Design an enzyme around this catalytic site. Sequence first.
Site, PDB file in Angstrom:
ATOM      1  N   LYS A  14       2.405   1.685  -3.480  1.00  0.00           N
ATOM      2  CA  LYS A  14       1.461   2.177  -4.481  1.00  0.00           C
ATOM      3  C   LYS A  14       1.297   3.684  -4.337  1.00  0.00           C
ATOM      4  O   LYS A  14       1.175   4.404  -5.324  1.00  0.00           O
ATOM      5  CB  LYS A  14       0.089   1.512  -4.331  1.00  0.00           C
ATOM      6  CG  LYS A  14      -0.012   0.104  -4.921  1.00  0.00           C
ATOM      7  CD  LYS A  14      -1.454  -0.400  -4.880  1.00  0.00           C
ATOM      8  CE  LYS A  14      -1.958  -0.545  -3.442  1.00  0.00           C
ATOM      9  NZ  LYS A  14      -3.372  -1.053  -3.377  1.00  0.00           N
ATOM     10  N   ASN A  15       1.276   4.156  -3.093  1.00  0.00           N
ATOM     11  CA  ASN A  15       1.141   5.585  -2.826  1.00  0.00           C
ATOM     12  C   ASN A  15       2.342   6.383  -3.325  1.00  0.00           C
ATOM     13  O   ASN A  15       2.175   7.467  -3.903  1.00  0.00           O
ATOM     14  CB  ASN A  15       0.967   5.839  -1.321  1.00  0.00           C
ATOM     15  CG  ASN A  15      -0.387   5.417  -0.825  1.00  0.00           C
ATOM     16  OD1 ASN A  15      -1.300   5.215  -1.623  1.00  0.00           O
ATOM     17  ND2 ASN A  15      -0.538   5.290   0.496  1.00  0.00           N
ATOM     18  N   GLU A  65       0.808  -1.218   0.000  1.00  0.00           N
ATOM     19  CA  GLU A  65       0.000   0.000   0.000  1.00  0.00           C
ATOM     20  C   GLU A  65       0.846   1.276   0.000  1.00  0.00           C
ATOM     21  O   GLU A  65       0.522   2.246  -0.689  1.00  0.00           O
ATOM     22  CB  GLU A  65      -0.938   0.014   1.210  1.00  0.00           C
ATOM     23  CG  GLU A  65      -2.044  -1.048   1.185  1.00  0.00           C
ATOM     24  CD  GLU A  65      -2.918  -0.951  -0.056  1.00  0.00           C
ATOM     25  OE1 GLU A  65      -3.260   0.181  -0.464  1.00  0.00           O
ATOM     26  OE2 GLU A  65      -3.262  -2.010  -0.620  1.00  0.00           O
TER      27      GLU A  65
HETATM   28  N1  LIG Z   1       3.630   9.218  -0.680  1.00  0.00           N
HETATM   29  C1  LIG Z   1       2.614  10.120  -0.904  1.00  0.00           C
HETATM   30  N2  LIG Z   1       2.859  11.277  -1.556  1.00  0.00           N
HETATM   31  C2  LIG Z   1       1.901  12.178  -1.787  1.00  0.00           C
HETATM   32  N3  LIG Z   1       0.656  11.987  -1.383  1.00  0.00           N
HETATM   33  C3  LIG Z   1       0.317  10.855  -0.720  1.00  0.00           C
HETATM   34  C4  LIG Z   1       1.302   9.865  -0.454  1.00  0.00           C
HETATM   35  N4  LIG Z   1       0.700   8.866   0.208  1.00  0.00           N
HETATM   36  C5  LIG Z   1      -0.559   9.161   0.370  1.00  0.00           C
HETATM   37  N5  LIG Z   1      -0.838  10.380  -0.184  1.00  0.00           N
HETATM   38  C6  LIG Z   1      -2.141  11.078  -0.192  1.00  0.00           C
HETATM   39  O1  LIG Z   1      -3.037  10.449   0.809  1.00  0.00           O
HETATM   40  C7  LIG Z   1      -4.249  10.028   0.112  1.00  0.00           C
HETATM   41  C8  LIG Z   1      -4.851   8.722   0.651  1.00  0.00           C
HETATM   42  O2  LIG Z   1      -3.845   7.720   0.529  1.00  0.00           O
HETATM   43  P1  LIG Z   1      -4.455   6.288   0.933  1.00  0.00           P
HETATM   44  O3  LIG Z   1      -4.853   6.251   2.370  1.00  0.00           O
HETATM   45  O4  LIG Z   1      -3.364   5.184   0.705  1.00  0.00           O
HETATM   46  O5  LIG Z   1      -5.786   5.989   0.007  1.00  0.00           O
HETATM   47  P2  LIG Z   1      -5.664   6.094  -1.653  1.00  0.00           P
HETATM   48  O6  LIG Z   1      -4.174   5.779  -2.041  1.00  0.00           O
HETATM   49  O7  LIG Z   1      -6.056   7.483  -1.980  1.00  0.00           O
HETATM   50  N6  LIG Z   1      -6.858   4.955  -2.009  1.00  0.00           N
HETATM   51  P3  LIG Z   1      -6.405   3.348  -1.691  1.00  0.00           P
HETATM   52  O8  LIG Z   1      -6.344   2.539  -3.059  1.00  0.00           O
HETATM   53  O9  LIG Z   1      -7.543   2.702  -0.755  1.00  0.00           O
HETATM   54  O10 LIG Z   1      -5.112   3.229  -0.996  1.00  0.00           O
HETATM   55  C9  LIG Z   1      -3.801   9.828  -1.342  1.00  0.00           C
HETATM   56  O11 LIG Z   1      -4.897   9.760  -2.276  1.00  0.00           O
HETATM   57  C10 LIG Z   1      -2.888  11.028  -1.542  1.00  0.00           C
HETATM   58  O12 LIG Z   1      -3.653  12.212  -1.782  1.00  0.00           O
HETATM   59 MG   LIG Z   2      -3.135   4.133  -1.239  1.00  0.00          MG
END
Ligand SMILES: Nc1ncnc2c1ncn2[C@@H]1O[C@H](COP(=O)(O)OP(=O)(O)NP(=O)(O)O)[C@@H](O)[C@H]1O
Ligand SMILES: [Mg+2]
Lengths: 358, 353
Positions: free
Chosen positions: B235-236, B232
């Site tokens: 992917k972020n 996870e």
């Molecule tokens: N490494 C990162 N750099 C920049 N923004 C981030 C990063 N990680 C998370 N975010 C932000 O945090 C939000 C939520 O992340 P997250 O909780 O993992 O859900 P998601 O990635 O949006 N959906 P999911 O497929 O359920 O993981 C993202 O949509 C981004 O806007």
């Molecule tokens: Mg995510």
Amino acid sequence: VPREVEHFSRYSPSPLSMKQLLDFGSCERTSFAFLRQELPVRLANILKEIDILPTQLVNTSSVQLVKSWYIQSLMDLVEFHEKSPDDQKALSDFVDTLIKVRNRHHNVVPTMAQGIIEYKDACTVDPVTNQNLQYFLDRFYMNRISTRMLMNQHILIFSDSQTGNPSHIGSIDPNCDVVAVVQDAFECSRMLCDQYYLSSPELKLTQVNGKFPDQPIHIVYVPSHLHHMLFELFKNAMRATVEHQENQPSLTPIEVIVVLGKEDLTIKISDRGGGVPLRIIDRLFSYTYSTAPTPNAPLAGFGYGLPISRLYAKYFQGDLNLYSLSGYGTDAIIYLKALSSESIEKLPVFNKSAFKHY
Amino acid sequence: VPREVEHFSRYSPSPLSMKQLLDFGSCERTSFAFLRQELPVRLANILKEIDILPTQLVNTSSVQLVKSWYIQSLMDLVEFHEKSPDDQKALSDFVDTLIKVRNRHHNVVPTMAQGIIEYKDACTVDPVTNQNLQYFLDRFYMNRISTRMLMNQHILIFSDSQTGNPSHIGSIDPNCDVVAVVQDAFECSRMLCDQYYLSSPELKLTQVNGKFPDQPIHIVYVPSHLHHMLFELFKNAMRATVEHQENQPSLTPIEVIVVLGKEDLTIKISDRGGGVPLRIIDRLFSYTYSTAPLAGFGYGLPISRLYAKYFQGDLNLYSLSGYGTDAIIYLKALSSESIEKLPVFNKSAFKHY
Ligand SMILES: Nc1ncnc2c1ncn2[C@@H]1O[C@H](COP(=O)(O)OP(=O)(O)NP(=O)(O)O)[C@@H](O)[C@H]1O
Ligand SMILES: [Mg+2]
Ligand SMILES: Nc1ncnc2c1ncn2[C@@H]1O[C@H](COP(=O)(O)OP(=O)(O)NP(=O)(O)O)[C@@H](O)[C@H]1O
Ligand SMILES: [Mg+2]
């Protein structure tokens, strides 16, 4: 408790933004009008709170002294309540009174810290785990940071004899050259480190202007506050690096990255000083917690560097955090608001809520 | 609120350590007596907590489905309290029931998620309730992570034909190759990233064993949980890097450092994906916060943090807006200190709401 203290403690402090503080230097009667009311409010709020500490601590000669000073300063200021802001002599006498108060409060932090120690050997107590003591000290020191800031702003802009830095408006640099402050703080830490170890890590610095690519990084800020934070974090990173690597031929540098984004200025300080267990991280931020004995100038010992630096960062809505990798090193991160209009004082208020915490 | 539910909700969950769960394979009748009691207790505690939620959330078809599933499973399990741990047939049937329960709960996460989305989309929500929902979701999902863990441990070890990998003890690997898991999780994310962006960042990994210098890093852990957290976060980092550097020829790599200290195993994932404003940092962990149109509904961070916290670890994020972000995972290095962090529906929780 003096009637003045009881009365003025009833009001809540009124926070200013750095922009508003700058603007005082753009009349004097406006600053006079605000401060003669606000300083007594801030002093009264913390005085009421001091009157809740453990009998054993409030009774330390050190705390009693601080209390007596704040009360006198409060009285000195209230004496101006009758004057008209249009009275030139009153304005001049007010500057003199702020100078007197500033001088009287000059040894407040050292006296309060000494009280904590006059508390430890005069009673059975662990200040590190005493949660109420920690809560109180954060509020007491933030209160002082704020009153000192406000009085110095007025003194440095309107007095005849105290002008401070020519490039500053009061103590605020509208075009604070962040990287320059970083380099200065690093050198100060380095000189101290050399005296204690005959060696110090070098600085590896990177800067990224996200808001304005390749442009020098500047924001409206109080350089003395920024310098304090960096100096304390550099001393920590240097001490940890040198001691963790004392059995090796050389020292890894301290890597710093300064980034300016759209609404935040971030500074990351990374060392390979061995880090600390996640279990202990919060303790690091407790007043008096130190792996060095309680103390010309000590590299470490007070146990104040982290909590005080964090207070400076949070004072204008920024923050300071430590993320460590036990067995490797630590990343210390400072966040500051990049807009003066969003840099608003974070002030403690003595109310039902605060009282509930005690 | 059937009798069994009120009854078992009166017990407080009993947390086990990673060290205890390992012994599941060293007997079956003791594990049987423990689970026939503990699973109903955990299901009942969360079921009672569900009834405290706003009426319009509780009445969504999604929450009603989840409630009906948990109730049926609780009843299926309570039935076994009349059987003897020495009843060989009861032990086999209990395993069959665990498999049945696992199947029935397969869709729990998305279903609960849908209920929350419908409730928030259609109803006005005050700050207090918003905070209570986050709190509820953290507890509800931690509860599911814990029951899934316990049930899988029993099935994988005592089932006749669903025992899983022989090198692990249940779902636990006594010598988890952390770096190997990191590499695998990175690749799974990269494969998805390529599929959607046609390009993906490379991995630059560093490792430091401060506990046993120059030696490979291993700890007792549940590899699938570790893989989930890394996957996870990767992917972020990949989505952020790719989208922030769209007007760039190449892509900066994702830097990862794995460290083993005396008490902690720490993994820091660094990207140059532009970061996020300090103001949004906390919001990132909210279940309903997402900037996704490789990404989705906003579960990555909060769920990953639950996996890390489940055995007393943690997950933090610090970002440099305008540059990039550091995501860090902390896990206990000692199995004896790796103890389940479980929500309990007691008066203290009731008040928090
Ligand atoms: N490494 C990162 N750099 C920049 N923004 C981030 C990063 N990680 C998370 N975010 C932000 O945090 C939000 C939520 O992340 P997250 O909780 O993992 O859900 P998601 O990635 O949006 N959906 P999911 O497929 O359920 O993981 C993202 O949509 C981004 O806007
Ligand atoms: Mg995510
Ligand atoms: N970068 C670091 N690496 C490892 N340990 C650290 C680091 N920074 C802080 N610490 C630990 O946190 C403790 C307290 O730090 P601090 O609050 O700055 O007070 P001090 O440095 O100990 N005394 P002083 O700075 O003179 O007030 C230190 O003594 C260390 O044990
Ligand atoms: Mg220090």
